[PDB]
Amino acid sequence: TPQICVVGSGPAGFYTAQHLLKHHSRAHVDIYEKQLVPFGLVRFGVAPDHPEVKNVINTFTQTARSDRCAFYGNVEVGRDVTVQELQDAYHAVVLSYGAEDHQALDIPGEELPGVFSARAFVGWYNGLPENRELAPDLSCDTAVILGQGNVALDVARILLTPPDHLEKTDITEAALGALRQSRVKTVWIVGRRGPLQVAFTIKELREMIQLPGTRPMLDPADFLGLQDRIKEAARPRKRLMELLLRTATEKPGVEEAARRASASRAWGLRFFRSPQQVLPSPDGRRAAGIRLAVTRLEGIGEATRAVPTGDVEDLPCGLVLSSIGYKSRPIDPSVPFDPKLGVVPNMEGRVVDVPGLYCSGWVKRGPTGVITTTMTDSFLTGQILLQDLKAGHLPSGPRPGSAFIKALLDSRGVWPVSFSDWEKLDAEEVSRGQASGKPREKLLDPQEMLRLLGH
Numbered sequence: 199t200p201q202i203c204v205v206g207s208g209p210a211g212f213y214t215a216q217h218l219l220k221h222h223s224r225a226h227v228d229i230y231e232k233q234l235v236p237f238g239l240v241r242f243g244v245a246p247d248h249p250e251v252k253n254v255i256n257t258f259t260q261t262a263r264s265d266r267c268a269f270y271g272n273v274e275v276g277r278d279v280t281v282q283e284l285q286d287a288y289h290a291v292v293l294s295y296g297a298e299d300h301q302a303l304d305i306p307g308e309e310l311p312g313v314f315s316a317r318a319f320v321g322w323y324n325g326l327p328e329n330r331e332l333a334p335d336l337s338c339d340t341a342v343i344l345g346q347g348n349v350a351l352d353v354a355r356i357l358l359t360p361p362d363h364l365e366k367t368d369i370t371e372a373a374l375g376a377l378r379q380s381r382v383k384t385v386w387i388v389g390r391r392g393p394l395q396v397a398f399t400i401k402e403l404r405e406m407i408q409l410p411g412t413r414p415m416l417d418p419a420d421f422l423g424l425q426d427r428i429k430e431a432a433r434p435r436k437r438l439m440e441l442l443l444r445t446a447t448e449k450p451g452v453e454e455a456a457r458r459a460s461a462s463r464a465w466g467l468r469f470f471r472s473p474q475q476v477l478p479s480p481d482g483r484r485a486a487g488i489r490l491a492v493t494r495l496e497g498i499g500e501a502t503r504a505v506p507t508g509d510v511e512d513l514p515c516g517l518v519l520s521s522i523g524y525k526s527r528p529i530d531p532s533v534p535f536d537p538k539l540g541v542v543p544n545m546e547g548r549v550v551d552v553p554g555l556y557c558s559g560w561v562k563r564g565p566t567g568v569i570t571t572t573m574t575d576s577f578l579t580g581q582i583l584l585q586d587l588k589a590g591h592l593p594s595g596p597r598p599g600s601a602f603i604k605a606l607l608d609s610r611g612v613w614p615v616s617f618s619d620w621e622k623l624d625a626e627e628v629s630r631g632q633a634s635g636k637p638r639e640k641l642l643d644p645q646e647m648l649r650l651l652g653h
């Protein structure tokens with residue numbers, strides 16, 4: 199019986215195991231995860247008001263219920279067990295542990311209270327234990343988000359949705375209460391390039407424009423010559439661009455003009471501005487604005503690079519959210535790493551110079567794909583791995599798998615969480631969300647979670 203194992207239980211991992219299980223009748227797959235619960239960013243990243251995006255959990259679960267698959271929660275690879283150990287124990291090892299860091303802003307004042315990375319702000323509301331005590335000061339009246347992608351859109355939306363519309367989501371009870379007292383009435387999504395280079399997608403952009411109680415603030419001037427450049431543009435790009443174009447230059451209607459008129463909150467899109475410095479409040483105890491450098495685009499097409507003009511702009515705010523870039527981290531000494539592209543060097547999923555060591559998901563291609571890309575691309579990694587297996591390019595005969603690895607964990611006093619254990623944790627989250635109308639009220643304390651399991 200071939201023994202394969204994966205590191206990370208997000209889409210990369212589950213989808214790679216899914217393929218392995220479907221295309222190899224007797225292989226056994228073990229999924230190691232550092233958090234106590236599986237699913238990674240489907241649970242800690244996808245916003246709470248996008249439950250439909252989280253329905254892939256339904257396919258993760260049927261994969262995890264195969265009699266040849268087992269989940270190992272609460273096992274931090276590169277600390278509880280090394281990659282080499284995993285490598286000696288199994289015939290193949292798949293690195294799929296995402297891209298955990300965020301790229302720092304690297305600008306003076308980035309330390310000031312009120313400056314957060316967008317991904318941490320999402321973990322706060324998404325119940326990722328390490329962000330539980332993030333306690334953001336939502337008492338200011340404005341928030342600036344650096345970077346124009348969906349993550350930026352996601353936090354903007356959550357800071358402006360009227361709290362009652364969030365009430366039946368799976369957002370944490372604690373974050374909900376923070377939003378209820380929030381005084382944040384305006385959200386600027388600042389980018390350094392232009393409308394052509396925003397990275398968001400149409401489903402999010404239109405949810406932003408139709409978000410009850412809010413009114414968009416686009417400057418007509420940013421969209422000059424827009425309709426002329428997108429003339430040749432493919433459907434996706436063009437539709438998006440006309441949606442931005444239309445919202446920026448057309449007069450609305452009598453009902454939509456009126457709705458915008460009475461909206462208490464607002465959100466805009468700023469362009470050709472790059473983060474230069476976080477501005478201090480008079481007393482130095484918090485952020486009170488951000489110093490932006492004016493930029494001008496040069497070069498053609500997909501190769502346009504902003505260049506400073508020399509001009510700067512001070513933009514007041516009491517919250518600076520950075521969402522410009524996630525990067526993988528080197529997990530074990532023995533694992534190759536490309537610090538530039540924050541990825542583990544590989545050739546279609548085969549790690550550079552280390553037989554039996556594969557990769558998939560963000561750690562394989564960079565932090566760009568959405569779940570479907572990650573989905574399909576992960577099946578490509580499973581294809582290679584099983585081809586190498588079939589060609590006999592993995593060690594032969596017999597490997598112990600979990601039998602060996604379980605021993606090491608036991609001896610180190612690491613208590614692994616099985617799939618069943620997660621099912622017991624799931625039940626409790628559901629039961630405690632019933633009283634308040636929610637799909638679940640997430641468990642934030644690992645000790646508490648371990649004790650409900652009997653440890």
Ligand SMILES: Cc1cc2nc3c(=O)[nH]c(=O)nc-3n(C[C@H](O)[C@H](O)[C@H](O)COP(=O)(O)OP(=O)(O)OC[C@H]3O[C@@H](n4cnc5c(N)ncnc54)[C@H](O)[C@@H]3O)c2cc1C
Pocket residue numbers: 205206207208209210211230231232233236237238239240242243244245248251273274275276294295296297298317320349352529558559560561567568569570572
């Ligand atoms: C805020 C946000 C919102 C998003 N919204 C959407 C959306 O709406 N739709 C969409 O299609 N995509 C969305 N995405 C993109 C999607 O989240 C990614 O495509 C996808 O989850 C990346 O999959 P992954 O399996 O590589 O990594 P991840 O999902 O990050 O997870 C990999 C797993 O590895 C585990 N792990 C990490 N280190 C270790 C270790 N040392 N030992 C053991 N286990 C470890 C992590 O805990 C994690 O569970 C969003 C991303 C973000 C950040």
